[PDB]
């Protein structure tokens, strides 16, 4: 799947790669023992391979989902190619970055 950034702004794309806990979970969900995800743009390209191991549970899940992101520049195209395990983007964000700020952690009302 390709997406051409026609927003005249940066687009923030996020996605995920799912790592099952055993090979049977892999086969049931994706029907391949060996999957891979590729995300590639004009200045981004990573390949993501699922890595299956016994892990301690977190929120009662032994599996894991690794989350990733990139800022697709105006005019550039991002391409997703997957054999399995891809947590695909559905909604993304068109933004223009400001001069540069930070996070405040508080309970004071607005």
């Amino acid at each position, epitope marked *: 799947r390709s997406y051409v950034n026609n927003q005249e702004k940066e687009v923030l794309v996020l996605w995920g790669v799912h790592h099952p*806990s*055993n090979i049977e*979970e892999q*086969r049931a969900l994706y029907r391949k023992d060996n999957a891979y995800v590729s995300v590639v743009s004009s200045n981004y390209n990573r390949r993501f391979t699922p890595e299956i191991a016994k892990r301690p549970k977190v929120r009662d899940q*032994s599996g894991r989902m690794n989350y990733y992101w990139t800022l697709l520049e105006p005019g550039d195209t991002i391409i997703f190619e997957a054999t399995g395990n891809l947590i695909a983007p559905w909604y993304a964000f068109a933004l223009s970055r400001g001069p540069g700020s930070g996070i405040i952690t508080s309970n004071a009302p607005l």
Partner: antibody
Amino acid sequence: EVQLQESGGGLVQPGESLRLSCVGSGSSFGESTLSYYAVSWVRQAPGKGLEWLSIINAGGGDIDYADSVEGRFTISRDNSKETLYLQMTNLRVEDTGVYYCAKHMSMQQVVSAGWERADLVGDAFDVWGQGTMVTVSS
Amino acid sequence: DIQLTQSPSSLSASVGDRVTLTCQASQDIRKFLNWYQQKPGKGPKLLIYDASNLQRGVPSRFSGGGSGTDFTLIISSLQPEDVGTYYCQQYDGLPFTFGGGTKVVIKR
């Protein structure tokens, strides 16, 4: 693959009860046993066609019934035992027939992966039992 | 409810003949339609799932076509092991309903 074996049927008086059991065994893709799938009961009266009765999803939710058996029949499943049930009540003569246990094609949950399907598909019956016969006659 | 009408009620054919079984639906059920063979005394075995997909291990001669309200199962080279009753069944909505069946009869 997954095999299915109905049991617990036979001859019962009118207005009585009877509990059919459907036992699963074996596994499909990804070591998926019967608790990964949604199952339905389907009956066949002697010499006639197939009538769907009730459906239950993998986790035991989204029960539904055919109007003809609503209130009398109750579906359920002990996934620990990989077994389905059909609790028939107030049995009428026309309830006589061969009661089948039929698995739906699509995978509905993979519990160890923490994956569920948001909907209940209820698509093709790719595995049936040999059937158990229920004869309602005084 | 939803009514499935199957034509004909039975067809007599010879080995090697190509036969077309009809299953028309009382409303647009997209491609949520499947076909089962049922030899007598035995349970139904699935042939075609979702209008046009051949189920694993079913002979390649079985084909299925259709969408909307007009569906057909096509047995390409009819074999004596095909004798039996063929039911179409839908799941576009509850209650799940079957056609009346079409009995295949062999001429020899």
